[PDB]
Structure formats: structure tokens, C-alpha cells
Write a protein that binds this ligand. Structure first.
Ligand SMILES: C[C@H](NC(=O)C(C)(F)F)[C@H](Oc1ccc2c(cnn2-c2cccc(C(=O)N[C@@H]3CCOC3)c2)c1)c1ccc2c(c1)OCCO2
Ligand SMILES: C[C@H](NC(=O)C(C)(F)F)[C@H](Oc1ccc2c(cnn2-c2cccc(C(=O)N[C@@H]3CCOC3)c2)c1)c1ccc2c(c1)OCCO2
Ligand SMILES: [Zn+2]
Ligand SMILES: [Zn+2]
Ligand SMILES: [Zn+2]
Ligand SMILES: [Zn+2]
Lengths: 10, 326, 323
DNA sequence: GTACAGAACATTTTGTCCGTCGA
DNA sequence: TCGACGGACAAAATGTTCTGTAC
């Protein structure tokens, strides 16, 4: 979920 | 009186048609000297220096390259895709390596893993800025980075090593350069040689900056899940765009109909060998990560990708894209 | 270890406020006095190092101002013998007045290669202690390492006659980039090119090359051992010691010498994969009934006798690093 | 009577050796 | 005695003119 959170944030 | 003929190489007034090309006197003898002289001219810039009357003494690597692009033998305020790639190119990060303390395989590999984690963070923000990446599904974006992170790291490291240390050393960061002393350290040599092949090929091929920028984006789009992606139809047209983009950079560089293909052949042939470089780099990285006895430190970001990748390669659910064999 | 803050060459003192070499001191004093319009050909971030300081004067002057500048021999040695018996350079006999072909080039190189392989036999027959081995070992070692010897000798010739960038096969048949992209040629050249690249990367000596090639002849052995294994093991470690002696003759620092032996013996090891990959294409071509490339009888005999040894696993490839 | 290749001279740019002079 | 400055000298890199030679 750490890689996903980097993608999701603007 | 007739309009002065121009030198197809330095744009100064041409003295005639020397060595098949409309060239000046200074450019003619520079070319006869480069051929017979046996020189391994290196570029201080990025293999795309401007050759003109004022700057022809500047770079002999790019002047001798321009003589071959013109054919010797014996506006621009409309952004392009590669002009965006240049502007979104990640910055140089420092390792934070304490040089006042003796080297060790553990300290060197730990520092580079902790650095590689930060390089990965930038590689994510870089991917988001590539035109069309955030258009694809989130599960596809996550997959593409997970699959091609080592292609992007060994490609950008190879280019930094090519440019900064004449392709002799690995230039991980300005403060952590794997020299001849550090390479002969335990468990170092073999992994460094794989990174050095990338640098040694970029050296042999004299890759230009625009070409490198295109090959790097193409590396992100080089490993796909065996069955496909959630937005595979879109993925294909995106990858196809950067192949045409690479071809555009090869047209500037070569300036010749038959040269343009021989060039495309080699760059795309290198892009293929990158799968074998990453295959070998990941074999040792995965072995080290699982090796409890070595106990080297991997950051919270990188460890997460490593764990979620080990059974995907050992599953065969990875369709490696090729330009030449298949 | 004093280094120039501008060109990274060995600094000669504290010049004009900064620790620089002599060449940068006068570059700076010149660039200041001579009111110059130094234009950069790149992006004003050119690399200023020893080799490329002559290149961008605009970037060198910028780096200067950034750093803070302002105003009786009769006893022959083992390696001396290897120098004498080292084979002469041969000629491919390639007529360059007719366009190039993959068939024409591979066939000419196979023909020259056959002759180079005969010269390897006369050369091995003269290596001190090699003639002492059993004849059915002298020919086993010659058969196993044949491609290792030819690739390493070609790699040395390519390194010597230019740098890593091309393949100097014969004085009359050099393989340039336009020749390399002929059908089927690229992948086979890629392996040969590596050997010249490593020889270049390491800046290998002639005395080091001579010793390494002898170790390449003694690099592959039979899985069931040689008929003269007592003597082969003794000959091999004599040449390993000889390679070390040739590394001594260079720098001379204990750790520098050890590291050089590590890198040199790592290359001697990698030659097993370089030869394994060179043979896969050679054997594929030899059997191919579409390409029709002709191999000389000298090399055809070796290829035929080596294909089933390769499959059966009767080749014990020796390793210095055993990783 | 033009137009090139290569050699011969020439200029430009870069790098070293050395004496001076202050500390 | 040492260490830096600059001048004098040298090497490397680049550029021009003259000549032969093919039309
Ligand atoms: C995870 C690996 N760990 C293992 O394999 C191991 C050995 F620990 F097991 C780790 O890999 C890398 C690979 C590249 C790395 C780093 C650190 N910096 N760079 C780098 C440099 C320049 C640019 C970019 C870059 O990507 N820049 C932008 C982002 C995208 O666009 C451009 C990245 C770590 C590794 C660690 C130590 C190693 C090693 C390999 O190989 C040699 C022996 O020591
Ligand atoms: C058998 C191969 N044929 C195939 O693999 C193929 C293509 F047919 F499949 C053949 O190999 C070689 C390998 C080295 C060769 C030659 C010819 N001269 N040298 C050489 C040069 C310098 C030194 C020495 C040497 O040994 N000197 C001393 C004597 C002993 O001590 C030292 C030998 C042919 C080959 C053919 C064509 C190739 C090719 C490879 O590679 C690229 C694509 O074209
Ligand atoms: Zn010109
Ligand atoms: Zn350049
Ligand atoms: Zn300097
Ligand atoms: Zn510059």
C-alpha cells in the first residue's frame, strides 16, 4: 500500500 | 555574385565538396585527422553538442559524429514529447555516504539500497509526469513500476556512469562512486559488472540525450503481466508513441535514410538486452533480500516491491516485450 | 592525493584562491585577461575532467569561478619464452573491391580462423611444460580452449589496434559498425567485442596477456580428469604464479596487486561464458543447411568432435572464483 | 581553366618548466 | 626553505595555402 499511496497523492 | 555555399557540418562558408560532402577547409582536415588519427573522442555534453563556426573546436566527439551524419567517407517553441521528458528528468541524489569511515560491502550495499529507495520515489513522480501514464488504470501503473523498476535504475545509472566517469566506474551518486578498490570487495564485483554492461553499451553506441530519454520511457513500458493489463488497448498505443518518438530522435541524430535504420536496430537491440541485464540484477538482489545471513538493509519502499515481485517472476506471469527475436 | 577542484587532475598548489592544477591556473588567468566570448555547445553543464577539460572553455571558466577563483639478462624468464613463440599476425585474403556479405565475411573468417588454429598448435607445442604432457591431453586441451584462445587473441588485437569499439580480425578484415549490422553478424560480434572491452577497461599488459592466454589453454579439462593430471595441475599453478609476476612489474602496491589479480582472474573466468555463447552460434551455423557458410577442414574436425563432448558434460571448466 | 585530395606551412589554444619574491 | 605567481617555453589541436592531378 506504500507504492499505491505515492501514486494516489497529487 | 553567388550566395555563399555553407558547410553541412559547421555552417561556415564551404570551400568545396570534400569527402562526398559540401564541407569547409577546417572541417575537411578535421575529418581526415579523426579517421587516420585513431582517437576515442569523448563528449563533455550529451552527444548532441551544437556544431557551428564558433563551437567546432568545442567538441571533437560531436564534430566527428556530425561528419558521419552529413555523409563523409573515403520556431522550435512547439514542445515535443522528448522536450517534456528532458524537463521531467529526475535530479541527481546524494547517497549520504560517510567517506571519513572505512568501506565495507554491508555499508556500501545498505547505503545504495537506502539511496535506491529515494531514486524509486522520484521514478514514481517521473512516471506520473510521462504523458499518458496516469491515463492508464492504477493497477496497471502499479504493475508497470513493479516490473520495470530495475530497468529504469540500471539504465539511468548506466547513463550517469557513461557520462561522469568515461564508462570506467559506477556513479551511483556524487559521494558514492564504486571505484576499482570498492569493486573487488566481497559480493560486489559480479553485480557491478552487470550495471557496467549498460554503461559500456551506451559508450559503444554513443547514445545521444534525446535517444536515452526515449529508451528510458520505453523501458518503463517493457515488462507486462503475461495475460495483459486492465487498460492494455491504451498501453499499446502509448508504447507505440514512444517507439515513434525514439525514431524521431534517431532522424535528428543520423541525418540519413539507411543510417536511420541501422541505428534503430542497435538501440532497440540494446533495449532487448536490458531484459537480460535486469534478469541477472534481480537474481542477485532477490537472493540477497532472502539471505538472512548477509542481513543487508532495504528501505520500506523497495522491500515492499521486492516481496511483491519474487513469486511473479518464478510464476512466469511476466511477458517480456522484444523488438527483435519475438 | 591532491586533486584539482576544477579538472580533477592531480592539483599542483593553491592557485588564485583555489586548489587547482597548473593547467587550470593558466586557463583561468588567460580567460580573465583575454576578454572572451566562451560559448557552450551543450547545456552549460559540461563535464570538466582531465580528459575533457580542453572541450568546453565556457564550462571550465564557469567551474573556475564557481570553485572561488579570483585575481646480465642471459637467463630467459618463462614469460620471455611466451613472447617469442607468440604467433605472427595472419591475412584473411579479403578482396575489398567487391561488396560485403554475411556469407563472404563468415567464410573468409572461418578460412583465416582455420589457419590461426594451426598456429595455436605450433604455439602450444612450444609452451614450457606443455610438450611434457601426454599427447592425448596436449590435443584435449587444444580442442577445449580453441575458441577461448582465438577470442582472447582477437580481443587483444582489437584492443591494441584501436579500442573496444571494433573487431580487428585480420589487418585486411576489420569489422566496423556497418559490417556488424549485416544479417546474423551482430550477436556473434557482441561476444568478441566484450573481450576487447574488458582488455581496454583493465588496460592489460602484453606480459599479462601472454600469461592469461597460456592460462586459457589450461582453462578447460575433462570431467573424468586428464591422463597427466599430476603434471597439468603443476604447469597451471606455474603460469598462475607467472601472471602474478607480470602484475608485480606494474604498480607494485600490495592491495593494488591483489585487486589487479582479482580483476584479471575474473576476466579469465568470464571467458567460459564468452566461449559458451560464441560456440552456440558457431555450432548452430555449422549444422545450418540454409546459410551454407564453409568452414575449413581444420576447424570442421574440432567442431564435430566438440559438439557431443559439450552435450555429454565431459568438460570441467576451471574457475578461479567459484562463486 | 575549375575542383578536389593531401602535404606544407601556419595559427590558435592549451599545458609545463622556471626564476622571482614574499613568508 | 616553501609556495604561489607569471613569464617563457613547449606541446596539442586546429586551420590555411600550395601543389599535383583528373576532368
Ligand atoms: C536494489 C539493489 N540492491 C541489490 O541488488 C543488492 C546488491 F543489495 F542486492 C540496488 O539497486 C540500485 C540500482 C540503481 C541505483 C541504486 C541507487 N542509486 N541508483 C541509481 C543511480 C542513478 C540513477 C538512478 C535512477 O534510477 N534515477 C532516476 C529514477 C528513474 O529515472 C532516473 C538510480 C540502487 C543496488 C544496491 C547495491 C549494489 C547494487 C545494486 O549493484 C552493485 C553492487 O551494489
Ligand atoms: C569459428 C568462428 N565461426 C563462427 O563462429 C561462425 C560465424 F561461423 F558461426 C570464427 O571464429 C574466429 C575467431 C577468431 C579468429 C577467426 C579468424 N581469425 N581469428 C583470429 C584473430 C586474431 C588472432 C587469432 C589467434 O588465435 N591468434 C593466435 C593463434 C593462437 O594463439 C594466438 C585468431 C575466426 C568466426 C567467424 C566469423 C565471425 C565470427 C567468428 O564472429 C563474428 C561474426 O563473424
Ligand atoms: Zn566546416
Ligand atoms: Zn559533444
Ligand atoms: Zn585543473
Ligand atoms: Zn559546456
Amino acid at each position: 500500500s506504500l507504492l499505491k499511496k505515492l501514486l494516489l497523492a497529487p | 555574385g553567388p550566395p555563399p555555399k555553407l558547410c553541412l557540418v559547421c555552417s561556415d562558408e564551404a570551400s568545396g565538396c570534400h569527402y562526398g560532402v559540401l564541407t569547409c577547409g577546417s572541417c575537411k582536415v578535421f575529418f581526415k585527422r579523426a579517421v587516420e588519427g585513431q582517437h576515442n573522442y569523448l563528449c563533455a555534453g550529451r552527444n548532441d553538442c551544437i556544431i557551428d563556426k564558433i563551437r567546432r573546436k568545442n567538441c571533437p566527439a560531436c564534430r566527428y559524429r556530425k561528419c558521419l551524419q552529413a555523409g563523409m567517407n573515403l520556431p522550435q517553441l512547439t514542445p515535443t514529447l522528448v522536450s517534456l521528458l528532458e524537463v521531467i528528468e529526475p535530479e541527481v541524489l546524494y547517497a549520504g555516504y560517510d567517506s571519513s569511515v572505512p568501506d565495507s560491502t554491508w555499508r556500501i550495499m545498505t547505503t545504495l539500497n537506502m539511496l535506491g529507495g529515494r531514486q524509486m520515489i522520484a521514478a514514481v513522480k517521473w512516471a506520473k509526469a510521462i504523458p499518458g501514464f496516469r491515463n492508464l488504470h492504477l493497477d496497471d501503473q502499479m504493475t508497470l513500476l513493479q516490473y520495470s523498476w530495475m530497468s529504469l535504475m540500471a539504465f539511468a545509472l548506466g547513463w550517469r556512469s557513461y557520462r561522469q566517469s568515461s564508462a570506467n566506474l559506477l556513479c551511483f551518486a556524487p559521494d558514492l562512486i564504486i571505484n576499482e578498490q570498492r569493486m573487488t570487495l566481497p559480493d560486489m564485483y559480479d553485480q557491478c559488472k552487470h550495471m557496467l554492461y549498460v554503461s559500456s553499451e551506451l559508450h559503444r553506441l554513443q547514445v545521444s540525450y534525446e535517444e536515452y530519454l526515449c529508451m528510458k520511457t520505453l523501458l518503463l513500458l517493457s515488462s507486462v503481466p503475461k495475460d495483459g493489463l486492465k487498460s492494455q488497448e491504451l498501453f499499446d498505443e502509448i508504447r507505440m508513441t514512444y517507439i515513434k518518438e525514439l525514431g524521431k530522435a534517431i532522424v535528428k541524430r543520423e541525418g540519413n535514410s539507411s543510417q536511420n535504420w541501422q541505428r534503430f536496430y542497435q538501440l532497440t537491440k540494446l533495449l532487448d538486452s536490458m531484459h537480460e541485464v535486469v534478469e541477472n540484477l534481480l537474481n542477485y538482489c532477490f537472493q540477497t533480500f532472502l539471505d538472512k545471513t548477509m542481513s543487508i538493509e532495504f528501505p520500506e519502499m523497495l522491500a515492499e516491491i521486492i516481496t511483491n515481485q519474487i513469486p511473479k517472476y518464478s510464476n512466469g506471469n511476466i511477458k517480456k516485450l522484444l523488438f527483435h527475436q519475438k
